[PDB]
Design a protein around this ligand. Structure first.
Ligand SMILES: O=S(=O)(NCc1ccc(S(=O)(=O)c2ccc(O)c(O)c2)cc1)c1cc(O)c(O)cc1-c1ccc(O)c(O)c1
Ligand SMILES: O=S(=O)(NCc1ccc(S(=O)(=O)c2ccc(O)c(O)c2)cc1)c1cc(O)c(O)cc1-c1ccc(O)c(O)c1
Ligand SMILES: O=P(O)(O)OC[C@H]1O[C@](O)(COP(=O)(O)O)[C@@H](O)[C@@H]1O
Ligand SMILES: O=P(O)(O)OC[C@H]1O[C@](O)(COP(=O)(O)O)[C@@H](O)[C@@H]1O
Ligand SMILES: O=P(O)(O)OC[C@H]1O[C@](O)(COP(=O)(O)O)[C@@H](O)[C@@H]1O
Ligand SMILES: O=P(O)(O)OC[C@H]1O[C@](O)(COP(=O)(O)O)[C@@H](O)[C@@H]1O
Ligand SMILES: O=C([O-])C(=O)[O-]
Ligand SMILES: O=C([O-])C(=O)[O-]
Ligand SMILES: O=C([O-])C(=O)[O-]
Ligand SMILES: O=C([O-])C(=O)[O-]
Ligand SMILES: [K+]
Ligand SMILES: [K+]
Ligand SMILES: [K+]
Ligand SMILES: [K+]
Ligand SMILES: [Mg+2]
Ligand SMILES: [Mg+2]
Ligand SMILES: [Mg+2]
Ligand SMILES: [Mg+2]
Lengths: 425, 425, 436, 422
């Protein structure tokens, strides 16, 4: 039905192993990755990556989120960077195969006691320029997140707040920070100066584990491919660090000086893409899913119940994809928390939700712009078929494949409750 | 509430080891779920009265066994008529009507090598009288099952064949027998004379384990409550044997002389019902589900994929039931093989499938009698509502409960592919 | 296959086909069940002790000799019936039958004597008849007391007090027979030497359909605590009048052993029944089959995980010795013990290897029958001048008795457990020895 | 306080996810650093005074890279290492043995090259402990190295360096005939795609752990420290992850051979390794290693598993083992006990070589002998206890597991004892 060649690719012999030791022993350098790269790449925009032509190459290389570092540069400089990112992204709207949403993240300068005056003005600039995400620098407690949230004025409540943990207090007050944040960034640069350098891996692994448990996005950042600022190829420790951040459970990986000021920005993005695909296939899904299942509390929320049912169904048939209809991105995020091997194709009419779901591992957003059908069930079926035809065009799906389809019983967000098993025709 | 997590051995269910599970079993933790292991009662002089059969149905009898080792065809035709009269006396209330299967247990080959001439005549009688199941005595090899199947003819294709394993050869050729049978009976009476008595528990536990792995019904039979032929209460070894057969994984438990000729036929049924409910709550679902999940092969069949997704969803929300629409019983059987704690409420129009699904643990058949609605989606919804109304009347469901609803995309058998999370209103 | 490949070449494929070894090496409990084989014959000596109630059908010296040969390890005297004179004669007849085999020390089988009390009746605590019966037990040197209707910790303190200063060595097994005993189980087990699941009264005091829950819970808690647990009443009931038991009865005996019972019991089946010797033989045959079907892989992992961390060297040595025995499929673990405690701590980890306990205490040799898999050897030789030589002679006595009983063969590996100094409480050494 | 240190809350966790969630930057390491550090000797680390600081910083094995330098250059490096090591021999209870490893130039465009035959002969003549054989592609390459060592170099350990696709594909046959493996990531990262090296590293470490044979992770672990005083975030992560993967040894090349901060690079690997060792999830690791090790009738194998099980049961501070060749200590090390394996030996070479096995702390016994063999055994066990107390491994009240044999000579380990300190 599938063949022996299918079960040799994407580390499938290591995936079927009964123990983690046997899983390690079965990892094969000849077993090629087949799935689309699921860990998003965040690239910092700067002099080396600001031009429209350079940004087109970075989008082609795999950049999903553009980071604007407000520690340097004026509002005029950042507005031009945003315009250049949007021009490069929209240059592909002519091809359904190549077009892809790209999120814009504003990384704040940081705090002084409460929110700094500059952070109030920069956060206001972010709302006025329609940024998708804020990477809030030096978050130490829950009230720091509340201050950032308050500064997103009356118009920016939909912006995602990713709290950067950069010091001892942020690590010790992690639970209260995660509770009020949309996600976390393990900001290793400052963390490695604030706490002993030999302890950063403990903070990284703990925070990734807690974010995976909570079902909230976690970003691993700083010096991942540092030597690539001046060299065309990274060190053995750098490729290892990127692979290990993905294996740890990071939803996103980041590039700072490598893309902002370095001599090889496109090559750094290509390297993170290549390593992430290899590491995602080496994830031990058998124990990971069992542990996420056991640790996740019992739930009476139908979206959560449908998500675990759909992920279980996808593993049973080695589904190529889980197609989900989502307005806010929440139904796709709840599928992503169970770490399915199947790609989560999220069909949405919200351009902002399509950009923001790049924060969740394995979510592939498809922005739907057709006019709504008069009969709701027909409009649902057209979106499901749009996800199928996009998957066929992009290589995720072929005729005869099985896909899992996740929908709700009525229009509007919060009603996901249906899982279907569909044969691709 | 806290009261919910104290009942049905839920503290023992959440235990991390089987030792801790045993240590947490509580005699004060009352069973809440409906009794899932079916009871087979042998019909005889003590249970032929139509009025006594009505009491046995109320006590919990699901399958009526006709032992063709004794009595003429005229005697068995009267037993069938009496069973049907008692069963159909409750048809006036469709929301509470309980289907009861009729099983024909053959005399056997005796000294011969294959199908006896009396068995050919008895099997023909079974087809002519519309029996649901055949318990084929002394099955020693796959060709014995083929001979029974051939003697049933073209009109008996829908009859389930349960092979009785009663000797050393049947145990040694178990795998080839199970492959061609619908299920197995561990016929301990003859097995305990054919092999050393001290080895029967090994054959019983092995056969139940292999049937559970194959997802095929297994019956534990003979002397389970033997002393109740003459005494009002059973021995400590008898209650232990019934509880251990359920814990082993038996889909059905049986009564022979206890209901056929004894003085306490209704009390013997009530005793098996009471013990089975206690033992089902003491099942260690945590390890059992994990092992059944791991041992079940990967599948591209949408019914199989939907079934595991629905069982996983039911465990996530502590669903009171999985309501499934089924024509042949197959969709309910595939749910049952994963041993959900949630009751599998199977709604069917087939009177025969409603009787036959009693062979699968935890399947509660509801016979739907209404003619099809003009709109197929409304006909589906009406059957789901019938499952809910029957469930509320019978005590399976209450307002506020969560239920998993399993349906298909088109009419006819073989198209189950949808799982839905529904709140009971 | 790789985890058992070199051992399969050395010991042979026939070795790994016996005693349910394919089911023992299974990775899941489901696969373990699927691999159980009626053609896989038991090889190990029967480890679950049999308690037989003495009465008119089993009182004669000649009948008792046949019951000892059939497998009786503990003789129960039911003080609910019979006078002190009747029970003293039963004790004398048991001792005469047991000592008729003392002429061959390498094969002599110790047999314990247990006194089962009448109980409190309608009273709240220790009855006056129980005080007199317990005093009789001490005067007649009984090894164990099965205390009827224990409902709380103070009931076992009262039994202990009635035994007096001369009965400090007697083991107290509390009988749980009602709802209160089940609910106060933890406090009762804490002060008792062990427990008896007394299913007769328990099945009348609580709903009959709940007894299996109480049995499985109490056996699990006793296994966790490392204290003996007895399953009792109606196990082979039909054998009181019939030569063969029912299918439910053989299943009940097998399931009590699989549950984790250290001992199984016969009441009317041996006391007044027509087939006392056959009932003992039946429990022996079923127990050997069920012991081989135990899923040691998960059982040992769970007993290790659940057992608390310990700084007691006897406890630490015991787990190391059981781990070593599993690693090499050891035929036996030979242990030197004064009180039986070192053998009990090995037994709590449920090794497949027989625990051959060499002791000079005749009472400890009888009492260790309460612990599953402990085979007591009574050493009669006087102490050597050099203590290290005396230790070695006792280990050699265990090996020679083991060879002359079928437990050991040349080429087998045995684990030897000893201590660093004389006296009880100093076990701290584990040795791997090849049998020559 | 005991259960708050060395990541003990994360150690008691029921799942790997919960283990990760419980890792605490405030939980300080207490155990001695288990993973050995291999430092490459060169112009930056050749002086006797510099070597004394590197030994104090944690260097356990000195690597001589025969790709550069003459035989005269390497003989002087060996003499300087031995002078620095023996400068601490005046205090036998704290003396740290240091192994000398010869890393070959390799076959180049050719089997065994003529330069490798001469270099291996030099190694035997100068008493090297280990050979890191470059570019091992098959079992016959190991046999050729073994033959070039001759009858005098029978005791030298051969660690095969896997540096290309063929070495990875023929890994099982190479490991079978080798004493251990080195994941030589420099050449491996050029021979196979750079993004696949982590797969080869994790697979080889897993297979070596399964076989109970030493595995070394090597190259660019702290690369930036060649010119900078502090490493990058990816470098500290790489060192920690090599230890978590299961590497027995970690290595420094240019960082110690030619860099500006050789002592600081050793101190950094020591600091990270201690943190990572405490974060190892022993609950699942021991269970998997125990399940996967085959059933055995060898008494040393049977005693080792019993001793490791006993150590976990009582939270033993150490397992003291008497060993002639190092084999009894290696069999204890394969189960990854949290308890330090204190190996007391009379063989100076075995004391140096056991640094290849994680958690083996070699003590070179140089005390006068005893007339009664049993008394000589007791004296070696007391020397292990006294050295353990002096070094901080043991305190009064601690429990230790003692592993010995029934007769003199190698191959007779069969006894395990539980001893209370003082
Ligand atoms: O390791 S065990 O052997 N059996 C553990 C065990 C039992 C039951 C389950 S199950 O999840 O419900 C399950 C049932 C049927 C399946 O098809 C199936 O896939 C799963 C799973 C595991 C054990 C461990 C202990 O710690 C102990 O005190 C007692 C026992 C014990 C020993 C022998 C027995 O036969 C027995 O009844 C109990
Ligand atoms: O028992 S272990 O500890 N491994 C633990 C282990 C690692 C990974 C998984 S995961 O399913 O991918 C998983 C990932 C993230 C989760 O959130 C998650 O829920 C699950 C699962 C388990 C061990 C066992 C071995 O046999 C061995 O050779 C090596 C190791 C090893 C290796 C790495 C370590 O960090 C370490 O401490 C030890
Ligand atoms: O993930 P979200 O934001 O809850 O959106 C899921 C929603 O999408 C749907 O599938 C389709 O809804 P719309 O037709 O309003 O887009 C709903 O049935 C469901 O509630
Ligand atoms: O379990 P079976 O026999 O495959 O029946 C399941 C079938 O029942 C249905 O849910 C309802 O079908 P009908 O309307 O024909 O009764 C189908 O969609 C599905 O294929
Ligand atoms: O099991 P117990 O009662 O603790 O007895 C174990 C004792 O037996 C011995 O092995 C031998 O002691 P004895 O010489 O007193 O018989 C002691 O070293 C050890 O302390
Ligand atoms: O680990 P190895 O090389 O087998 O050495 C272990 C040996 O050391 C001893 O403990 C002591 O032996 P020596 O007295 O010869 O040093 C032996 O009993 C044992 O066989
Ligand atoms: O701000 C950051 O990204 C950091 O400190 O790593
Ligand atoms: O035929 C039967 O039912 C038996 O033998 O048990
Ligand atoms: O007293 C007893 O032994 C009983 O009730 O089982
Ligand atoms: O030879 C080496 O050490 C390498 O290539 O890493
Ligand atoms: K910033
Ligand atoms: K029949
Ligand atoms: K009594
Ligand atoms: K070299
Ligand atoms: Mg920062
Ligand atoms: Mg029969
Ligand atoms: Mg009683
Ligand atoms: Mg190289």
């Amino acid at each position: 039905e599938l063949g022996t060649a299918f079960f040799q690719q994407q580390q499938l012999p290591a995936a079927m192993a009964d123990t983690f030791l046997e899983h390690l022993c079965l990892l094969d350098i000849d077993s090629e990755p087949v799935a689309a790269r699921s860990t998003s790449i965040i690239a910092t925009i700067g002099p080396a990556s600001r031009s429209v032509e350079r940004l087109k190459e970075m989008i082609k290389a795999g950049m999903n989120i553009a980071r604007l570092n407000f520690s340097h540069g004026s509002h005029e400089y950042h507005a031009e960077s945003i315009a250049n990112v949007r021009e490069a992204v929209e240059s592909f709207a002519g091809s359904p195969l190549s077009y892809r949403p790209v999120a814009i993240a504003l990384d704040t300068k940081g705090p002084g006691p409460g929110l700094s005056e500059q952070d109030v003005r920069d956060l206001r600039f972010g709302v006025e320029h329609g940024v998708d995400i804020v990477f809030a620098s030096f978050v130490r407690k829950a009230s720091d997140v509340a201050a950032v949230r308050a500064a997103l004025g009356p118009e920016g409540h939909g912006i995602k707040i990713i709290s950067k943990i950069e010091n001892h207090e942020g690590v010790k007050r992690f639970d209260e920070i995660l509770e009020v944040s949309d996600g976390i960034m393990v900001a290793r640069g400052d963390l490695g100066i604030e706490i002993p350098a030999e302890k950063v891996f403990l903070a990284q692994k703990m925070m990734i584990g807690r974010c995976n448990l909570a079902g909230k996005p976690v970003v691993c950042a700083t010096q991942m491919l540092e030597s690539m600022i001046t060299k065309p190829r990274p060190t053995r420790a750098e490729t290892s660090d990127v692979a290990n951040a993905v294996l740890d459970g990071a939803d996103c990986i980041m590039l700072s000086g490598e893309t902002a000021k370095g001599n090889f920005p496109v090559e750094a993005v290509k390297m993170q893409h290549a390593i992430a695909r290899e590491a995602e296939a080496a994830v031990y899904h058998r124990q990971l899913f069992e542990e996420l299942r056991r640790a996740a509390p019992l739930s009476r929320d139908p979206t959560e119940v449908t998500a675990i049912g759909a992920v279980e169904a996808a593993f049973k048939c080695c589904a190529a994809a889980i197609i989900v209809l989502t307005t806010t991105g929440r139904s796709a995020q709840l599928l992503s928390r169970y770490r399915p091997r199947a790609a989560v194709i999220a069909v949405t009419r919200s351009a902002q939700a399509a950009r923001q779901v790049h924060l969740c591992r394995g979510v592939f957003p498809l922005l739907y712009r057709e006019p709504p059908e008069a009969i709701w069930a027909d409009d649902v079926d057209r979106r499901v078929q749009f996800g199928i035809e996009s998957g066929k065009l992009r290589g995720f799906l072929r005729v005869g494949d099985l896909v899992i389809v996740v929908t709700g019983w009525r229009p509007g967000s919060g009603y996901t409750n249906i899982m279907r098993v569909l044969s691709i025709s």
